[PDB]
Amino acid sequence: VTTFVALYDYEARTEDDLSFKKGERLQILNSSEGDWWLAHSLTTGQTGYIPSNYVAPS
């Protein structure tokens, strides 16, 4: 729905988290959980939760 870029590498901290590298383009699919957003990585094709402060708008 909106595209962001990852600011830092992130290793998943739950089984439902997305792992991603700095610079990945991430589509934000849901943001209702505040500091944790559901994202889809356009760079890798994977999906999961991310920390909202790890991304900035493209």
| Residue-range definition of the domain harbouring residue 57 | 1-58
How far is residue 22's CA from residue 34's CA, in Å, rounded to a whole number?
A: 21
Asked whether the beta carbons of 5 and 25 are under 8 A apart, the reply is yes
Question: Structure resolution in Å?
Answer: 1.1
How far is residue 15's CA from residue 3's CA, in Å, rounded to a whole number?
A: 23
Q: Which two tokens stand for residue 12?
A: 């998943």
Asked whether the beta carbons of 43 and 3 are under 8 A apart, the reply is no
Beta-carbon count within 10 A of 26 CB: 25
Beta-carbon count within 10 A of 11 CB: 8
How many structural domains comprise the chain? 1
Q: Which two tokens stand for residue 27?
A: 């589509």
Q: Which two tokens stand for residue 58?
A: 């493209």
Residue whose pair of structure tokens reads 């998943």 in the numeric block: 12
How was it solved?
A: X-ray
Single-letter amino acid, residue 10: Y
How far is residue 23's CA from residue 8's CA, in Å, rounded to a whole number?
A: 8
How far is residue 7's CA from residue 23's CA, in Å, rounded to a whole number?
A: 6
Q: Which two tokens stand for residue 39?
A: 């994202």
